[PDB]
Short mmCIF file of C-alpha atoms and ligand atoms in Angstrom, two decimals:
data_model
loop_
_atom_site.label_atom_id
_atom_site.label_comp_id
_atom_site.label_asym_id
_atom_site.label_seq_id
_atom_site.Cartn_x
_atom_site.Cartn_y
_atom_site.Cartn_z
CA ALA S 1 0.00 0.00 0.00
CA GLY S 2 1.42 3.34 -1.10
CA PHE S 3 3.00 5.36 -3.89
CA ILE S 4 6.21 3.33 -4.08
CA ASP S 5 5.19 0.03 -2.47
CA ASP S 6 2.76 -0.85 -5.30
CA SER S 7 4.91 0.52 -8.13
CA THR S 8 5.15 -1.44 -11.37
CA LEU S 9 7.95 -1.12 -13.93
CA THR S 10 7.16 -3.18 -17.04
CA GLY S 11 8.32 -2.98 -20.62
CA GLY S 12 8.27 -4.78 -23.91
CA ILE S 13 10.42 -5.78 -26.88
CA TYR S 14 8.62 -5.62 -30.22
CA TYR S 15 9.70 -6.79 -33.67
CA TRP S 16 7.77 -6.19 -36.89
CA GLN S 17 8.63 -7.43 -40.39
CA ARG S 18 6.33 -6.75 -43.32
CA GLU S 19 6.01 -7.16 -47.08
CA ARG S 20 2.98 -5.70 -48.88
CA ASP S 21 2.52 -5.54 -52.65
CA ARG S 22 -0.32 -3.83 -54.50
CA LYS S 23 -1.61 -3.85 -58.07
CA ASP S 24 -1.19 -0.72 -60.19
CA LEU S 25 -4.29 -0.18 -62.34
CA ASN S 26 -3.30 3.18 -63.85
CA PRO S 27 -3.58 2.28 -67.56
CA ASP S 28 -0.52 4.21 -68.80
CA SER S 29 1.83 3.02 -66.05
CA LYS S 30 4.83 0.77 -66.67
CA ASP S 31 3.66 -1.76 -64.04
CA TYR S 32 0.12 -2.04 -65.40
CA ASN S 33 -1.82 -4.96 -63.85
CA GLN S 34 1.25 -6.15 -61.90
CA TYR S 35 1.85 -6.24 -58.16
CA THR S 36 4.25 -3.51 -57.03
CA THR S 37 6.01 -3.13 -53.70
CA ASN S 38 4.08 -0.86 -51.33
CA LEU S 39 5.50 -1.58 -47.86
CA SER S 40 8.68 -3.50 -47.04
CA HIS S 41 10.47 -2.89 -43.75
CA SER S 42 11.86 -4.46 -40.60
CA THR S 43 11.26 -2.42 -37.45
CA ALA S 44 11.66 -2.89 -33.69
CA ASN S 45 10.14 -1.07 -30.72
CA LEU S 46 11.11 -0.87 -27.05
CA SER S 47 8.76 0.41 -24.34
CA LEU S 48 9.17 1.11 -20.63
CA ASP S 49 6.26 1.85 -18.29
CA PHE S 50 6.35 3.05 -14.69
CA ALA S 51 3.03 3.04 -12.82
CA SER S 52 3.00 4.16 -9.20
CA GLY S 53 0.60 3.00 -6.54
CA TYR S 54 -1.68 5.52 -4.82
CA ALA S 55 -0.52 7.86 -2.07
CA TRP S 56 -3.23 8.07 0.59
CA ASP S 57 -4.89 5.57 -1.76
CA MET S 58 -5.96 8.58 -3.84
CA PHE S 59 -3.17 10.05 -6.00
CA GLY S 60 -0.69 8.35 -8.32
CA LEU S 61 1.04 8.87 -11.65
CA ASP S 62 2.12 6.93 -14.73
CA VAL S 63 4.98 7.71 -17.10
CA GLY S 64 5.88 5.80 -20.24
CA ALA S 65 8.07 6.16 -23.33
CA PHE S 66 9.06 3.97 -26.25
CA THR S 67 11.79 3.89 -28.89
CA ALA S 68 11.60 2.86 -32.54
CA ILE S 69 14.53 1.40 -34.50
CA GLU S 70 14.56 0.92 -38.28
CA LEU S 71 16.35 -2.32 -39.17
CA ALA S 72 15.65 -2.58 -42.91
CA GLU S 73 13.56 -0.83 -45.55
CA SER S 74 13.32 -0.94 -49.33
CA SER S 75 13.55 2.05 -51.65
CA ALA S 76 9.99 1.37 -52.82
CA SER S 77 8.58 1.26 -49.27
CA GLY S 78 5.85 3.85 -48.83
CA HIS S 79 5.54 6.10 -45.80
CA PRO S 80 4.61 6.17 -43.03
CA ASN S 81 4.62 2.47 -42.07
CA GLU S 82 3.12 3.30 -38.62
CA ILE S 83 5.69 1.19 -36.70
CA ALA S 84 8.68 3.50 -37.02
CA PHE S 85 8.26 7.26 -36.68
CA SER S 86 7.13 9.53 -39.50
CA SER S 87 9.85 11.90 -40.68
CA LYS S 88 7.45 14.76 -39.92
CA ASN S 89 6.66 15.18 -36.24
CA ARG S 90 2.99 16.27 -36.23
CA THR S 91 -0.32 15.15 -37.72
CA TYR S 92 -0.92 18.02 -40.14
CA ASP S 93 2.74 18.25 -41.24
CA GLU S 94 2.66 14.80 -42.84
CA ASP S 95 4.41 14.72 -46.22
CA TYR S 96 4.32 10.92 -46.64
CA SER S 97 8.03 11.53 -47.28
CA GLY S 98 9.93 9.13 -45.04
CA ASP S 99 10.42 7.28 -41.77
CA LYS S 100 12.97 7.39 -38.96
CA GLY S 101 13.79 6.15 -35.48
CA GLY S 102 13.65 7.97 -32.19
CA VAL S 103 11.90 8.18 -28.84
CA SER S 104 8.45 9.39 -27.77
CA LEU S 105 6.79 10.09 -24.43
CA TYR S 106 3.43 8.35 -24.78
CA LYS S 107 2.24 8.21 -21.15
CA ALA S 108 2.48 10.98 -18.55
CA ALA S 109 -0.66 10.89 -16.44
CA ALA S 110 -1.70 11.86 -12.95
CA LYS S 111 -4.32 9.35 -11.82
CA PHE S 112 -6.93 9.82 -9.10
CA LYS S 113 -9.12 7.28 -7.32
CA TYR S 114 -11.45 7.55 -4.34
CA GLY S 115 -14.59 5.60 -3.55
CA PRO S 116 -16.50 4.98 -6.79
CA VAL S 117 -14.71 7.82 -8.65
CA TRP S 118 -11.56 7.78 -10.77
CA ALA S 119 -9.73 10.17 -13.07
CA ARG S 120 -6.64 10.60 -15.24
CA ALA S 121 -5.01 13.68 -16.75
CA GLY S 122 -1.99 14.58 -18.85
CA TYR S 123 -0.86 12.42 -21.76
CA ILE S 124 -3.41 9.60 -21.56
CA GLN S 125 -5.26 6.89 -23.44
CA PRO S 126 -9.06 6.62 -23.16
CA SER S 127 -9.86 3.97 -20.56
CA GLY S 128 -13.55 4.33 -19.66
CA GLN S 129 -16.74 4.05 -21.72
CA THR S 130 -16.44 6.91 -24.22
CA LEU S 131 -16.16 6.51 -28.00
CA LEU S 132 -12.73 8.17 -28.09
CA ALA S 133 -9.87 5.74 -28.68
CA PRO S 134 -6.19 5.77 -29.66
CA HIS S 135 -4.48 4.42 -32.75
CA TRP S 136 -2.71 1.14 -31.96
CA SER S 137 0.46 -0.08 -33.62
CA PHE S 138 2.60 -1.81 -31.05
CA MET S 139 2.13 1.26 -28.86
CA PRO S 140 -1.00 3.41 -28.55
CA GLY S 141 -1.43 6.99 -29.57
CA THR S 142 -1.88 9.54 -26.83
CA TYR S 143 -4.28 12.40 -26.16
CA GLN S 144 -3.35 15.54 -24.23
CA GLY S 145 -6.32 15.84 -21.89
CA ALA S 146 -8.22 14.36 -18.98
CA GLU S 147 -10.79 11.66 -18.26
CA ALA S 148 -13.09 11.15 -15.28
CA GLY S 149 -15.88 8.76 -14.43
CA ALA S 150 -17.68 6.81 -11.73
CA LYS S 151 -19.60 3.59 -11.13
CA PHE S 152 -23.13 3.08 -9.80
CA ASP S 153 -23.18 -0.40 -8.26
CA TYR S 154 -26.64 -1.93 -7.80
CA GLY S 155 -25.34 -5.17 -6.32
CA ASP S 156 -26.66 -8.18 -8.21
CA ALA S 157 -29.04 -5.93 -10.18
CA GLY S 158 -26.01 -4.78 -12.21
CA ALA S 159 -23.56 -1.90 -12.35
CA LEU S 160 -23.62 1.30 -14.41
CA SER S 161 -20.28 2.81 -15.43
CA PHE S 162 -20.15 6.25 -17.06
CA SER S 163 -17.18 8.30 -18.21
CA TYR S 164 -16.32 11.66 -19.76
CA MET S 165 -13.13 12.56 -21.63
CA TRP S 166 -11.79 15.80 -23.07
CA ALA S 167 -8.71 16.45 -25.20
CA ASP S 168 -7.24 19.28 -27.28
CA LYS S 169 -4.20 17.57 -28.87
CA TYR S 170 -3.40 14.08 -30.13
CA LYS S 171 -0.42 12.06 -31.32
CA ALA S 172 -0.47 8.77 -33.20
CA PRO S 173 2.16 6.13 -32.34
CA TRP S 174 4.16 7.09 -35.46
CA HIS S 175 4.36 10.76 -34.38
CA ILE S 176 6.69 12.11 -31.69
CA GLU S 177 4.75 15.33 -31.05
CA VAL S 178 1.10 16.17 -30.38
CA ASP S 179 -0.85 18.50 -32.66
CA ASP S 180 -4.20 20.28 -32.62
CA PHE S 181 -7.41 19.12 -34.29
CA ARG S 182 -8.71 20.44 -37.61
CA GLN S 183 -11.41 19.90 -40.21
CA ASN S 184 -11.22 18.09 -43.55
CA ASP S 185 -9.47 21.13 -45.06
CA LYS S 186 -6.58 20.59 -42.61
CA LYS S 187 -6.86 24.33 -41.88
CA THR S 188 -9.95 25.21 -39.84
CA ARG S 189 -9.23 24.63 -36.17
CA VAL S 190 -11.13 22.17 -33.98
CA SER S 191 -10.83 23.38 -30.40
CA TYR S 192 -11.43 20.10 -28.58
CA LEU S 193 -12.72 16.56 -28.76
CA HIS S 194 -14.87 15.27 -25.91
CA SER S 195 -17.17 12.31 -25.33
CA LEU S 196 -19.57 10.96 -22.71
CA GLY S 197 -20.31 7.25 -22.54
CA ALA S 198 -21.67 4.59 -20.23
CA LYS S 199 -21.98 0.83 -19.77
CA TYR S 200 -24.51 -1.26 -17.86
CA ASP S 201 -23.34 -4.74 -16.86
CA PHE S 202 -26.19 -6.95 -15.64
CA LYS S 203 -23.68 -9.57 -14.40
CA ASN S 204 -25.59 -12.28 -16.29
CA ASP S 205 -23.54 -11.98 -19.51
CA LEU S 206 -25.73 -9.15 -20.86
CA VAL S 207 -23.99 -5.81 -21.41
CA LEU S 208 -25.34 -2.54 -22.83
CA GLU S 209 -22.89 0.14 -23.95
CA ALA S 210 -23.52 3.59 -25.41
CA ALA S 211 -21.54 6.76 -25.99
CA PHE S 212 -21.77 10.05 -27.88
CA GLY S 213 -19.02 12.51 -28.74
CA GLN S 214 -18.22 15.75 -30.48
CA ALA S 215 -15.50 17.51 -32.44
CA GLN S 216 -15.91 21.16 -31.43
CA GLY S 217 -18.20 22.91 -33.89
CA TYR S 218 -17.80 20.24 -36.57
CA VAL S 219 -18.75 16.57 -36.11
CA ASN S 220 -21.13 14.61 -33.86
CA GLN S 221 -20.47 10.91 -33.24
CA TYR S 222 -22.58 8.15 -31.70
CA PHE S 223 -22.03 4.58 -30.51
CA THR S 224 -24.22 1.84 -29.04
CA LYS S 225 -23.69 -1.85 -28.38
CA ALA S 226 -25.56 -4.80 -26.90
CA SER S 227 -23.73 -8.06 -26.24
CA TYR S 228 -25.08 -11.28 -24.76
CA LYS S 229 -23.61 -14.75 -24.18
CA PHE S 230 -25.94 -17.75 -23.88
CA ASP S 231 -25.75 -21.49 -24.54
CA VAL S 232 -26.62 -23.43 -27.69
CA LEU S 233 -26.11 -27.18 -27.20
CA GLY S 234 -24.09 -26.40 -24.07
CA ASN S 235 -21.41 -24.09 -25.48
CA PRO S 236 -20.69 -20.36 -25.04
CA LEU S 237 -22.25 -18.54 -28.01
CA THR S 238 -21.33 -14.85 -27.89
CA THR S 239 -23.50 -12.28 -29.66
CA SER S 240 -23.43 -8.53 -30.18
CA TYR S 241 -25.32 -5.88 -32.11
CA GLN S 242 -23.40 -2.67 -32.76
CA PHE S 243 -24.18 0.78 -34.13
CA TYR S 244 -21.85 3.62 -35.09
CA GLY S 245 -23.11 7.00 -36.27
CA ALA S 246 -21.70 10.33 -37.38
CA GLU S 247 -22.93 13.74 -38.55
CA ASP S 248 -21.26 16.96 -39.65
CA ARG S 249 -22.37 20.54 -38.98
CA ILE S 250 -21.50 22.04 -42.38
CA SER S 251 -24.55 23.49 -44.13
CA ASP S 252 -22.96 23.66 -47.58
CA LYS S 253 -22.49 20.34 -49.39
CA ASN S 254 -19.83 21.84 -51.69
CA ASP S 255 -17.72 23.19 -48.82
CA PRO S 256 -14.44 21.19 -48.78
CA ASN S 257 -15.19 20.46 -45.10
CA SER S 258 -18.60 18.80 -45.60
CA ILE S 259 -18.03 15.06 -45.33
CA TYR S 260 -21.48 13.55 -44.58
CA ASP S 261 -24.99 14.10 -45.93
CA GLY S 262 -27.35 13.45 -43.05
CA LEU S 263 -26.59 10.57 -40.70
CA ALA S 264 -23.77 8.23 -41.70
CA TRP S 265 -23.79 4.93 -39.84
CA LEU S 266 -22.17 1.51 -39.59
CA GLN S 267 -24.25 -1.34 -38.14
CA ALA S 268 -22.81 -4.74 -37.26
CA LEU S 269 -23.99 -8.12 -35.99
CA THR S 270 -21.49 -10.59 -34.51
CA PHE S 271 -21.61 -14.25 -33.53
CA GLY S 272 -18.96 -16.28 -31.74
CA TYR S 273 -19.00 -19.96 -30.87
CA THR S 274 -16.40 -22.33 -29.39
CA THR S 275 -16.85 -26.07 -30.00
CA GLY S 276 -13.94 -28.04 -28.56
CA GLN S 277 -10.77 -26.63 -30.13
CA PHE S 278 -12.40 -24.57 -32.92
CA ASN S 279 -13.21 -20.90 -32.33
CA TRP S 280 -15.71 -19.79 -34.98
CA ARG S 281 -16.57 -16.18 -35.82
CA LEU S 282 -19.41 -14.98 -38.06
CA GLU S 283 -19.96 -11.24 -38.48
CA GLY S 284 -21.48 -8.83 -40.97
CA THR S 285 -21.69 -5.08 -41.51
CA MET S 286 -23.80 -2.55 -43.39
CA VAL S 287 -22.79 1.05 -44.07
CA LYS S 288 -24.50 4.25 -45.16
CA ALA S 289 -22.23 7.22 -45.86
CA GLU S 290 -23.81 9.73 -48.22
CA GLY S 291 -21.76 12.87 -48.78
CA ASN S 292 -18.38 13.91 -50.10
CA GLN S 293 -16.33 11.38 -48.12
CA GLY S 294 -18.22 8.30 -49.31
CA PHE S 295 -17.11 6.04 -46.46
CA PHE S 296 -17.81 5.84 -42.73
CA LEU S 297 -15.12 6.76 -40.20
CA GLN S 298 -15.18 5.93 -36.50
CA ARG S 299 -12.89 8.89 -35.74
CA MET S 300 -14.37 12.37 -35.41
CA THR S 301 -11.58 14.20 -37.26
CA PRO S 302 -11.31 12.97 -40.87
CA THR S 303 -7.59 13.60 -41.46
CA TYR S 304 -5.30 10.57 -41.36
CA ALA S 305 -3.82 10.10 -37.85
CA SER S 306 -5.53 13.16 -36.32
CA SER S 307 -7.49 11.03 -33.82
CA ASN S 308 -9.21 7.67 -33.48
CA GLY S 309 -12.57 6.37 -32.33
CA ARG S 310 -13.92 3.18 -30.83
CA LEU S 311 -14.75 0.39 -33.29
CA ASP S 312 -15.14 -3.17 -32.00
CA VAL S 313 -15.24 -4.71 -35.50
CA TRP S 314 -11.78 -5.58 -36.83
CA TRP S 315 -11.33 -8.41 -39.33
CA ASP S 316 -7.61 -7.89 -40.08
CA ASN S 317 -8.30 -8.42 -43.79
CA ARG S 318 -6.65 -5.15 -44.90
CA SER S 319 -9.71 -3.39 -46.29
CA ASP S 320 -11.96 -1.52 -43.89
CA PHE S 321 -15.11 -2.49 -45.85
CA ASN S 322 -16.75 0.83 -44.93
CA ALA S 323 -17.86 2.30 -48.26
CA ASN S 324 -21.23 3.98 -48.74
CA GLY S 325 -23.91 1.32 -49.14
CA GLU S 326 -21.45 -1.54 -48.63
CA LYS S 327 -22.51 -4.83 -47.07
CA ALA S 328 -19.92 -7.35 -45.91
CA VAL S 329 -19.98 -10.80 -44.31
CA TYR S 330 -17.04 -12.21 -42.35
CA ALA S 331 -16.31 -15.79 -41.31
CA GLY S 332 -13.20 -16.98 -39.50
CA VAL S 333 -11.89 -19.87 -37.46
CA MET S 334 -8.90 -20.40 -35.18
CA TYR S 335 -7.91 -23.97 -34.31
CA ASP S 336 -6.12 -24.59 -31.01
CA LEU S 337 -3.28 -27.08 -31.50
CA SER S 338 -3.18 -28.22 -27.87
CA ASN S 339 -4.65 -31.61 -28.79
CA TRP S 340 -1.85 -32.00 -31.32
CA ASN S 341 0.37 -31.55 -28.24
CA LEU S 342 1.41 -28.01 -29.20
CA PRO S 343 0.01 -25.86 -26.37
CA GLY S 344 0.12 -22.13 -27.00
CA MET S 345 -0.11 -22.67 -30.77
CA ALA S 346 -3.05 -21.74 -32.98
CA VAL S 347 -3.77 -21.61 -36.72
CA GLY S 348 -6.77 -20.00 -38.37
CA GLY S 349 -8.18 -18.30 -41.42
CA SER S 350 -10.65 -15.67 -42.53
CA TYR S 351 -12.86 -14.79 -45.48
CA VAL S 352 -14.65 -11.52 -46.25
CA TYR S 353 -17.23 -11.01 -49.00
CA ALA S 354 -18.45 -7.47 -49.65
CA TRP S 355 -20.93 -6.15 -52.20
CA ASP S 356 -23.19 -3.21 -53.06
CA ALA S 357 -20.42 -0.65 -52.48
CA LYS S 358 -21.30 2.77 -53.90
CA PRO S 359 -19.00 5.79 -54.30
CA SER S 360 -19.09 9.27 -52.79
CA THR S 361 -22.25 11.19 -53.64
CA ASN S 362 -20.18 14.07 -54.99
CA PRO S 363 -21.61 14.37 -58.53
CA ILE S 364 -18.17 14.30 -60.18
CA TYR S 365 -18.11 10.50 -59.77
CA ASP S 366 -20.30 7.96 -61.56
CA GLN S 367 -23.12 7.18 -59.13
CA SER S 368 -24.08 4.04 -61.11
CA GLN S 369 -20.95 2.20 -59.95
CA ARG S 370 -21.31 -0.90 -57.79
CA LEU S 371 -18.12 -2.35 -56.33
CA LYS S 372 -17.52 -5.77 -54.77
CA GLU S 373 -14.44 -6.66 -52.73
CA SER S 374 -13.35 -9.87 -51.01
CA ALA S 375 -10.38 -11.18 -49.06
CA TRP S 376 -8.98 -14.15 -47.19
CA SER S 377 -6.27 -14.47 -44.56
CA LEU S 378 -4.27 -17.20 -42.82
CA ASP S 379 -2.97 -16.76 -39.27
CA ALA S 380 -0.44 -18.75 -37.24
CA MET S 381 0.08 -17.89 -33.58
CA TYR S 382 2.33 -19.17 -30.81
CA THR S 383 2.69 -18.04 -27.18
CA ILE S 384 5.84 -19.45 -25.61
CA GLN S 385 5.20 -21.74 -22.64
CA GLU S 386 8.85 -22.37 -21.66
CA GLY S 387 10.51 -20.32 -18.94
CA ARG S 388 13.08 -17.95 -20.42
CA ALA S 389 10.86 -16.30 -23.05
CA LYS S 390 7.67 -17.07 -21.12
CA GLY S 391 4.70 -15.17 -22.54
CA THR S 392 6.40 -14.02 -25.75
CA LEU S 393 3.88 -14.01 -28.60
CA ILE S 394 4.75 -14.96 -32.20
CA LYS S 395 2.21 -14.20 -34.92
CA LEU S 396 2.40 -14.70 -38.69
CA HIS S 397 -0.41 -13.08 -40.70
CA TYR S 398 -0.99 -13.38 -44.45
CA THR S 399 -3.78 -11.74 -46.44
CA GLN S 400 -4.87 -11.75 -50.08
CA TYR S 401 -7.27 -8.91 -50.91
CA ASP S 402 -9.23 -8.73 -54.18
CA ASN S 403 -10.78 -5.59 -55.66
CA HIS S 404 -13.27 -6.74 -58.32
CA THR S 405 -12.95 -3.57 -60.44
CA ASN S 406 -10.24 -1.91 -62.51
CA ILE S 407 -10.62 1.44 -60.72
CA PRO S 408 -7.15 2.70 -59.72
CA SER S 409 -6.55 2.87 -55.98
CA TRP S 410 -8.44 5.71 -54.25
CA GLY S 411 -10.25 6.68 -57.48
CA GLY S 412 -13.73 6.49 -58.94
CA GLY S 413 -15.18 8.09 -55.81
CA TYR S 414 -14.08 5.22 -53.54
CA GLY S 415 -11.73 7.41 -51.53
CA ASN S 416 -10.91 4.65 -49.02
CA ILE S 417 -10.58 1.63 -51.34
CA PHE S 418 -7.39 0.34 -52.97
CA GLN S 419 -6.56 -2.30 -55.56
CA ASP S 420 -5.61 -5.96 -55.12
CA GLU S 421 -3.10 -6.53 -52.35
CA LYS S 422 -0.83 -9.23 -50.95
CA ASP S 423 0.31 -8.76 -47.35
CA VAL S 424 2.49 -10.77 -44.96
CA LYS S 425 3.13 -9.62 -41.39
CA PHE S 426 5.56 -11.19 -38.91
CA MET S 427 5.26 -10.07 -35.28
CA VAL S 428 7.09 -10.89 -32.06
CA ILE S 429 6.01 -9.37 -28.73
CA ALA S 430 8.12 -10.07 -25.63
CA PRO S 431 7.02 -8.34 -22.40
CA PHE S 432 9.18 -8.00 -19.31
CA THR S 433 8.82 -6.68 -15.77
CA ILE S 434 11.70 -5.05 -13.90
CA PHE S 435 9.85 -4.63 -10.61
C1 LIG Y 1 -0.92 -4.37 -27.49
C2 LIG Y 1 -0.52 -4.40 -28.93
O1 LIG Y 1 0.64 -4.16 -29.29
N1 LIG Y 1 -1.47 -4.72 -29.82
C3 LIG Y 1 -2.87 -5.02 -29.51
C4 LIG Y 1 -3.58 -5.50 -30.81
O2 LIG Y 1 -3.85 -6.90 -30.68
C5 LIG Y 1 -4.88 -4.79 -31.15
O3 LIG Y 1 -4.62 -3.53 -31.75
C6 LIG Y 1 -4.64 -3.51 -33.22
O4 LIG Y 1 -3.28 -3.59 -33.78
C7 LIG Y 1 -3.19 -3.53 -35.22
C8 LIG Y 1 -1.71 -3.44 -35.55
O5 LIG Y 1 -0.92 -4.21 -34.66
C9 LIG Y 1 -3.98 -2.35 -35.81
O6 LIG Y 1 -4.03 -2.49 -37.23
C10 LIG Y 1 -4.36 -1.26 -37.93
O7 LIG Y 1 -5.72 -1.28 -38.33
C11 LIG Y 1 -6.14 -0.06 -38.95
C12 LIG Y 1 -7.62 -0.22 -39.23
O8 LIG Y 1 -8.37 -0.16 -38.03
C13 LIG Y 1 -5.32 0.23 -40.22
O9 LIG Y 1 -5.66 1.54 -40.66
C14 LIG Y 1 -5.57 1.85 -42.08
O10 LIG Y 1 -4.23 2.12 -42.45
C15 LIG Y 1 -4.03 2.45 -43.84
C16 LIG Y 1 -2.55 2.69 -43.99
O11 LIG Y 1 -1.84 1.47 -44.17
C17 LIG Y 1 -4.87 3.67 -44.25
O12 LIG Y 1 -4.69 3.86 -45.66
C18 LIG Y 1 -4.62 5.24 -46.15
O13 LIG Y 1 -6.00 5.74 -46.19
C19 LIG Y 1 -6.28 7.05 -46.75
C20 LIG Y 1 -7.77 7.11 -47.01
O14 LIG Y 1 -8.53 7.17 -45.81
C21 LIG Y 1 -5.49 7.34 -48.03
O15 LIG Y 1 -5.60 8.73 -48.31
C22 LIG Y 1 -5.51 8.90 -49.73
O16 LIG Y 1 -4.18 8.96 -50.08
C23 LIG Y 1 -3.99 8.99 -51.49
C24 LIG Y 1 -2.50 9.05 -51.69
O17 LIG Y 1 -2.10 8.49 -52.93
C25 LIG Y 1 -4.71 10.19 -52.12
O18 LIG Y 1 -4.94 9.86 -53.48
C26 LIG Y 1 -6.07 10.54 -51.50
O19 LIG Y 1 -6.29 11.94 -51.66
C27 LIG Y 1 -6.16 10.22 -50.02
N2 LIG Y 1 -7.56 10.18 -49.60
C28 LIG Y 1 -8.10 10.98 -48.66
C29 LIG Y 1 -7.20 11.99 -48.05
O20 LIG Y 1 -9.29 10.89 -48.35
C30 LIG Y 1 -4.04 6.92 -47.89
O21 LIG Y 1 -3.33 7.11 -49.11
C31 LIG Y 1 -3.97 5.45 -47.52
N3 LIG Y 1 -2.60 4.97 -47.66
C32 LIG Y 1 -2.23 3.68 -47.69
C33 LIG Y 1 -0.78 3.42 -47.96
O22 LIG Y 1 -3.03 2.78 -47.52
C34 LIG Y 1 -6.33 3.45 -43.86
O23 LIG Y 1 -7.09 4.63 -44.10
C35 LIG Y 1 -6.44 3.08 -42.38
N4 LIG Y 1 -7.82 2.86 -41.98
C36 LIG Y 1 -8.34 3.37 -40.86
C37 LIG Y 1 -9.79 3.06 -40.59
O24 LIG Y 1 -7.68 4.06 -40.09
C38 LIG Y 1 -3.82 0.15 -39.93
O25 LIG Y 1 -3.09 0.18 -41.16
C39 LIG Y 1 -3.47 -1.13 -39.16
N5 LIG Y 1 -2.07 -1.14 -38.78
C40 LIG Y 1 -1.18 -2.01 -39.29
C41 LIG Y 1 0.22 -1.89 -38.78
O26 LIG Y 1 -1.51 -2.86 -40.11
C42 LIG Y 1 -5.39 -2.29 -35.24
O27 LIG Y 1 -6.08 -1.15 -35.73
C43 LIG Y 1 -5.31 -2.24 -33.73
N6 LIG Y 1 -6.62 -2.00 -33.14
C44 LIG Y 1 -7.56 -2.94 -32.98
C45 LIG Y 1 -8.85 -2.47 -32.36
O28 LIG Y 1 -7.39 -4.11 -33.31
C46 LIG Y 1 -5.67 -4.57 -29.89
C47 LIG Y 1 -5.82 -5.79 -29.00
O29 LIG Y 1 -6.59 -5.49 -27.84
O30 LIG Y 1 -4.96 -3.60 -29.13
C48 LIG Y 1 -3.54 -3.77 -28.76
O31 LIG Y 1 -3.57 -4.03 -27.39
C1 LIG Y 2 -27.92 1.71 -23.77
O1 LIG Y 2 -28.65 1.26 -24.89
C2 LIG Y 2 -28.21 0.00 -25.31
C3 LIG Y 2 -27.86 0.05 -26.79
O2 LIG Y 2 -28.37 -1.10 -27.43
C4 LIG Y 2 -28.61 -0.89 -28.80
C5 LIG Y 2 -30.01 -0.29 -28.96
O3 LIG Y 2 -30.24 0.20 -30.26
C6 LIG Y 2 -29.67 1.47 -30.48
C7 LIG Y 2 -29.35 1.65 -31.96
O4 LIG Y 2 -29.57 2.99 -32.32
CA1 LIG Y 3 -8.97 -7.67 -58.81
#
């Protein structure tokens, strides 16, 4: 009990190797219809995290920094690769010019706790029930701001948790320095992001979550979720409905800052089931995103890396499958190899089928277009059981993504869709505790 007596000092070694090739569909290019190198780099990260206890069981603080080391990169590797640091230090300075190593302070937070109340402030990550979230590479992004919340415990009738967060700057993992928020024009200032959100846990495997947020004078964001786990033939079958919504506050549709027409939303239905050694997943999404952007974003600032928002649907099949009008169905399976006498090992695969994808409603693009995209992935995983490298995770991920058009990447009004892609990712994560 105390500031120093409960201190933790953990860290992690991270290694990341990647090769990603993409088809060039520009007709008068020299690589026409061939795969070209897009990302190719070896990168390592090192993190160190101090987390004090609580003095008077009320006040404490956390500090944390990480380094990034570039081990190898090709001339044709695009930038930024999001593991190393971008050569430009802030969000809205990004040139897509290069990468580099260095060191970043990603955690510097005073934390408070008394009775049913808690709070954090400084350089933080969202930790409560809001729809704000950080970008995650190996390390998370960081907001400059504060978060506070409390819990209403009703005993066995459940427990309501609510939380509010506010921030005026943000920094993605691949940036060393925080920057302000701005609109789609990357000029008009956004004073703050803030969000209120809550969760009710019935303590019978039914959970209701909801949150709304705001980018000052610009965007309004919404989130709801309902998840329930019950038995079918005596096995845990997990379920969840999800809703994500967004609006803008720009009257003029032709303004470069207007990104949505009316309410843009992403709705999702998930199913999970575990029979013996097989973990099955079956999930599907539907999107509506009328307006100039043409695709739904969970983050409230539309510029790349400016901020991030909560989104519980991740299929790790490269494409975000979030185009206006797009439907997508996902099916995966991981197979535990413990009954082959390989504990800690797992192999699995994924398949995504998407259809009915329409472009931005900006009239300069053909509104008659209908795009279909699919993908499949293979995953191998291993968590070391032996002593020395106990807990070190090894993951190999391969994905083959198919765009069923000849539209060049980012064109035709599909501002967030790219052409066919091969991707292989090799990860190693080794955590360690000093004290
Ligand atoms: C503890 C720990 O270490 N890990 C835990 C981990 O298990 C989990 O965390 C998860 O980790 C993984 C990585 O490890 C995260 O993976 C990331 O996933 C996101 C999607 O959510 C990926 O984001 C996309 O990234 C690509 C870049 O590669 C973006 O592509 C760009 O998009 C824009 C369009 O929006 C393009 O702009 C266009 O640019 C062209 C230029 O030619 C121009 O013509 C146009 O004008 C312009 N259009 C505009 C401006 O509108 C841009 O060019 C393009 N560029 C490229 C090269 O593609 C894409 O937009 C991103 N999508 C979204 C959405 O952000 C991200 O790439 C991926 N990272 C990696 C390394 O693969 C994962 O997100 C993370 N989170 C989760 C929830 O899983 C969990 C476990 O609990 O947490 C940790 O604990
Ligand atoms: C709290 O409310 C729970 C949310 O559950 C989803 C209800 O539907 C809302 C979709 O708009
Ligand atoms: Ca194709």
